[PDB]
Write a protein that binds this ligand. Structure first.
Ligand code: HEM
Ligand code: HEM
Ligand code: HEM
Ligand code: HEM
Lengths: 146, 141, 141, 146
């Protein structure tokens, strides 16, 4: 990453306050609602016919927690996101056929969820550091596509 | 296209903004300049420092136009004609930048309107900002 | 919006494509698969090997749709309604990919129509593909 | 810059055949014509009112030749684009204030110009190598923005 010790600390410190379970379910759910076309990958989850049906779907909530989990662990390898997400990158390419653009949509949704949650705490400088992390993660995840 | 639900959602959210639109306008710009520094290339004549009067001033202008847009949600193209003109023929900002401002505007609303920033209102606001972006860049070529 | 000039330009260049539309459709796909590998994620069920009949078959369908759009240049939203529905509801291709194909289509035409690919025509063809992409993506949300 | 040896050879082989004077003028002219908003940086260039006005403007031709010149030099240091383009990156940001998205538009137009010029010789695989190259140059020119 091209994070400043100061930027690194900021990320790290707010993260410490995150409930991954809740932020994960909310980020994935919002994605499926704001950008409806991302639902193409989750037909097996059930009914995503409404915001309510999406936000309430337990399969969604649990996928969300799985996703933020892996994300969460990547924040511990901020100096080598590439190496941390290599296998996950191959998987998303070769098995899931997920367009990496989805990685970027999620990232933005994630930033909105954090703002939502931390109000005042989620200052311009703090968002700037997070924008750098979500972009970095999306890049690491898309790195092994071929 | 904005559905009736969408138009409702937007008018509500914006309703809550009220007398703070100007400050939210200013906050959205500050977040844009820090997060997407390439956007600064269009304001070389500004003092982009924190709490700059130029930025505040501009923030009000932007906020006002959004207000006007919400008010004429049904006739945006007509309500923003002059602004579409200005951007296409004078400012000539690259279309990609509109997505960056839109994004910073959502984050700002989210951070100030917790209760109101539901997933359904988030979806509508996003669509709205997209529509406004389309209108402001429709006369580019 | 497409001007009269643009319309003439597009009928003119597409006119020349004639009977090779099919083949140019296939080549544009191949260029896209090779330069923007991420686009492949939408054709996991395809044989994307050089000279694949699946790609050939597909190129033909894409070209038939463009040809249809040119024939109805004054009513594109209507002429392509069905395809707009398909992409929005079944295929659900992310909008960014439309610009990638558009680009490969332009490279293909350029490579085959040296005499007609003038700056003026290049400009008109680009506004055209962007309008096609807009229609195809209009019902996404 | 994932340039395979064979991709690098291909880039190099075709570049050998290019008349940079000519290509430079065509690429720049075509940019001002296809994306007229880009004209914002050249109001001192005179008449850009029509395609002939643009394509024929001695000022557009001279600047195009300059830009492609710096690009050709870049092609000889595919290994170190960032180093190669650092002072130029700095200037475009600090003095000229050119949004980096302009570098990507120019890249795409250049690819179209190469296709125009080489016909069948600009094969699917050759286009893919140039796509990597213009992206690499666009990124090197944006590296010093802040
Ligand atoms: C922050 C970015 C992301 C991370 C870290 C991530 C991580 C993961 C992980 C850890 C798994 C578990 C699968 C396994 O290990 O076998 C998974 C599965 C999956 N992901 Fe991703 N993912 C991300 C983004 C996305 C997005 C945006 C989508 C689609 C919108 C997506 C679609 C899927 C699908 C369809 C599966 C398979 C779930 C199943 O087996 O039912 N991922 N992802
Ligand atoms: C949400 C979409 C936007 C809206 C509603 C908007 C609205 C406005 C308004 C109301 C003005 C002032 C008009 C006047 O001075 O009478 C303006 C000017 C301007 N806008 Fe846009 N704007 C938007 C997006 C953008 C973006 C994304 C950029 C660049 C990143 C931009 C760059 C400018 C600049 C440079 C000025 C002139 C500032 C000055 O010199 O005072 N705008 N815009
Ligand atoms: C203007 C650009 C495009 C046009 C004119 C177009 C047109 C079409 C047409 C005519 C079909 C066949 C429908 C049928 O079965 O009758 C189709 C299918 C399809 N398109 Fe699009 N399309 C465009 C852009 C895209 C892009 C950018 C992608 C993704 C990279 C895409 C992905 C697909 C897929 C996956 C199918 C289904 C293929 C199959 O399973 O046979 N399309 N498109
Ligand atoms: C391949 C990408 C590019 C390269 C290698 C490049 C290279 C150069 C060079 C060598 C100069 C002269 C430096 C000097 O004056 O000291 C220059 C100046 C300039 N460039 Fe770039 N350029 C590129 C892209 C662009 C684009 C896309 C634009 C605008 C759309 C642009 C806008 C300018 C302007 C406005 C000047 C100064 C013109 C003047 O002398 O008044 N450049 N560029």
């Amino acid at each position: 990453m091209h994070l400043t010790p100061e930027e690194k600390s900021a990320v790290t410190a707010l993260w410490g306050k995150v409930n991954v379970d809740e932020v994960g379910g909310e980020a994935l759910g919002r994605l499926l609602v704001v950008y409806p076309w991302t639902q193409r990958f989750f037909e097996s989850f059930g009914d995503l016919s409404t915001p309510d049906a999406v936000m309430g779907n337990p399969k969604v909530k649990a996928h969300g927690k799985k996703v933020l989990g892996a994300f969460s662990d990547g924040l511990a390898h901020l100096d080598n996101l590439k190496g941390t997400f290599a296998t996950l990158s191959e998987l998303h390419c070769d098995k899931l056929a997920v367009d990496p653009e989805n990685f970027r949509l999620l990232g933005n949704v994630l930033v909105c969820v954090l703002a939502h949650h931390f109000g005042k705490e989620f200052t311009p400088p703090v968002q700037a550091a997070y924008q750098k992390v979500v972009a970095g993660v999306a890049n690491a995840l898309a790195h092994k596509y071929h | 296209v904005l559905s009736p639900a969408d138009k409702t959602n937007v008018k509500a959210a914006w309703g809550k903004v009220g007398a703070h639109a100007g400050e939210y306008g200013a906050e959205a710009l500050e977040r844009m300049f820090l997060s997407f520094p390439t956007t600064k290339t269009y304001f070389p004549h500004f003092d982009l420092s924190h709490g700059s009067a130029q930025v505040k001033g501009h923030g009000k202008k932007v906020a006002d136009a959004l207000t006007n847009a919400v008010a004429h949600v049904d006739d945006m193209p007509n309500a923003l004609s002059a602004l579409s003109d200005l951007h296409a023929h004078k400012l000539r900002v690259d279309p990609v930048n509109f997505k960056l401002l839109s994004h910073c505007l959502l984050v700002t609303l989210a951070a100030h309107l917790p209760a109101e920033f539901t997933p359904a209102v988030h979806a509508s606001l996003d669509k709205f900002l997209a529509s406004v972006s389309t209108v402001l860049t429709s006369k580019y070529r």
